[PDB]
Amino acid sequence: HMTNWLRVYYYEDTISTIKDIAVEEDLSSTPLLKDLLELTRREFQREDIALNYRDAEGDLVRLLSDEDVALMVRQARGLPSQKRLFPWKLHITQKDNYRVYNTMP
C-alpha cells in the first residue's frame, strides 16, 4: 500500500483533532502555500483558516508565504517510519483564533 499521508491538526479553540490526508506528491517534497490551502479546502471545506507549524521551541508559527513553508519543511524533525507520513505536520486554525499562539511575554 503506497499512499503518502500528511497528518494535520485541526483546531477548535486550543485543542486539535487529527486527520490523515492522502497526498500523491513525494514525501521528500516542498509544497507551495497555495496548494496546501487548496488541500485544506478540499478536506475541511473552509477557506477562513490559517495554516501553521510548531517550531522547535514549541511555539505555533503562522505560514504566510512559500518561503515560510520551506522553513517548516527544513526544520521537520520527523523520522521516516514505515507509515509513509510526511515528516512535518500541518496545523490548521480559524484565522481569528489567536489563543493558539504563544504571544504572551
Exactly one of 21, 23, 71, 85 binds another protein (CB under 8 A); that residue is 71
Exactly one of 13, 55, 78, 84 binds another protein (CB under 8 A); that residue is 55
Pairing label, strands 4-12, 90-94: parallel
Quick one: which segment of 10-18, 35-43, 63-71, 78-86 binds another protein (CB under 8 A)? 63-71
Among positions 12-51, residues that touch another protein (CB under 8 A) are: 50
69 lines the binding site for another protein (CB under 8 A): no
Minimum distance from residue 20 beta carbon to another protein (Å): 26
Which residue is listed with cell 475541511? 44
CA 90 – CA 105 distance, rounded (Å): 25
Q: What angle (nearest 5°) sits at the alpha carbon of residue 97, between those of residues 91 and 98?
A: 95
74 in Cβ contact with 87 (< 8 Å): no
Instruction: Give the residue with the Cβ less far from another protein, 19 or 62.
Output: 62
52 in Cβ contact with 93 (< 8 Å): yes
**Contact footprint for another protein (CB under 8 A):** 50, 55, 57, 59-62, 64, 67-68, 71, 98, 101-103, 105
